[PDB]
Write an enzyme that holds these catalytic residues in place. Structure first.
Site, short mmCIF file in Angstrom:
data_model
loop_
_atom_site.label_atom_id
_atom_site.label_comp_id
_atom_site.label_asym_id
_atom_site.label_seq_id
_atom_site.Cartn_x
_atom_site.Cartn_y
_atom_site.Cartn_z
N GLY A 58 6.69 -14.00 16.37
CA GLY A 58 5.53 -14.06 17.23
C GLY A 58 5.16 -15.50 17.53
O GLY A 58 6.03 -16.35 17.73
N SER A 87 13.08 -14.49 13.74
CA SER A 87 12.40 -15.65 14.33
C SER A 87 11.34 -16.14 13.34
O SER A 87 11.70 -16.42 12.19
CB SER A 87 11.87 -15.26 15.72
OG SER A 87 12.83 -14.49 16.42
N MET A 88 10.07 -16.24 13.73
CA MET A 88 9.05 -16.72 12.81
C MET A 88 8.94 -15.85 11.57
O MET A 88 8.42 -16.32 10.54
CB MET A 88 7.69 -16.80 13.51
CG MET A 88 7.46 -18.09 14.31
SD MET A 88 7.73 -19.63 13.39
CE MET A 88 6.88 -19.31 11.84
N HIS A 112 16.63 -17.95 15.71
CA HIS A 112 16.93 -18.49 17.03
C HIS A 112 16.01 -19.67 17.30
O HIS A 112 15.17 -20.03 16.46
CB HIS A 112 16.82 -17.41 18.13
CG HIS A 112 15.45 -16.84 18.30
ND1 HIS A 112 14.31 -17.61 18.34
CD2 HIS A 112 15.03 -15.56 18.47
CE1 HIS A 112 13.25 -16.84 18.51
NE2 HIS A 112 13.67 -15.59 18.59
N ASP A 161 20.40 -15.88 19.82
CA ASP A 161 20.06 -14.95 18.75
C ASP A 161 21.20 -14.84 17.74
O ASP A 161 22.34 -14.58 18.11
CB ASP A 161 19.72 -13.58 19.33
CG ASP A 161 18.34 -13.54 19.97
OD1 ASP A 161 17.96 -12.47 20.49
OD2 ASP A 161 17.64 -14.57 19.95
#
Ligand code: NA
Length: 182
Positions: A58, A87-88, A112, A161
């Site tokens: 996010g 991700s995060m 990523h 990704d």
């Protein structure tokens, strides 16, 4: 939401120093995580924190609020991946106390480069383009130091990704253990 003199199920587990990040990373969830992290430190500054992570990522700034708080507080923050950490979500997974970063065998890890946007005058587009580039370089240098990988390898591996299994995230250095049972 189930209840348990009458806690809720997520607050009953908060007594066991368990925090859940099972949602998108944003100012609302990161605010709760930070508040739970600070509270558990005030209760006991030495007992470990167990942060389960099932998040697709996010907002970057919301995530860095979680990251910095994890390093700011005295207690070791152990991170357990269940389901998916992308991700995060994966960044906060690799940010736990080294040696206590776990993932269950079928959990999904994905890293990523930052996502963003900018619309307006060309001057304002440049200002925001340089900002996200600094954020990208900051996150890469942090990922390299928390995985042991060279900086250039993290760069190539996060251009697009990058999906990994739990075992692949361990060898890569994103986690330390992969447990099927306790
Ligand atoms: Na800490």
């Amino acid at each position: 939401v189930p209840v348990v003199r009458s806690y809720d199920i997520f607050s009953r587990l908060l007594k066991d120093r368990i925090i859940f990040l099972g949602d998108q990373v944003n100012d609302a969830t990161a605010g709760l995580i930070v508040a739970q992290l600070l509270f558990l430190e005030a209760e006991d500054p030495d007992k470990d924190i167990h942060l389960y992570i099932n998040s697709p990522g996010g907002s970057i700034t919301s995530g860095m609020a979680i990251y910095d708080t994890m390093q700011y507080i005295k207690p070791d923050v152990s991170t357990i991946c269940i389901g998916m950490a992308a991700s995060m979500g994966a960044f906060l997974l690799a940010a736990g106390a080294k040696g206590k970063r776990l993932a269950l065998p079928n959990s999904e890890i994905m890293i990523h480069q930052p996502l963003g946007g900018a619309q307006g005058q060309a001057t304002d587009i440049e200002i925001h383009a340089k900002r996200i580039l600094k954020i990208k370089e900051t996150l890469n240098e942090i990922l390299s130091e928390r995985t042991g990988q060279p900086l250039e390898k993290i760069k190539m591996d996060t251009e697009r990704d990058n999906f990994m299994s739990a075992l692949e995230a361990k060898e890569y250095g994103l986690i330390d253990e992969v447990f099927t049972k306790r």
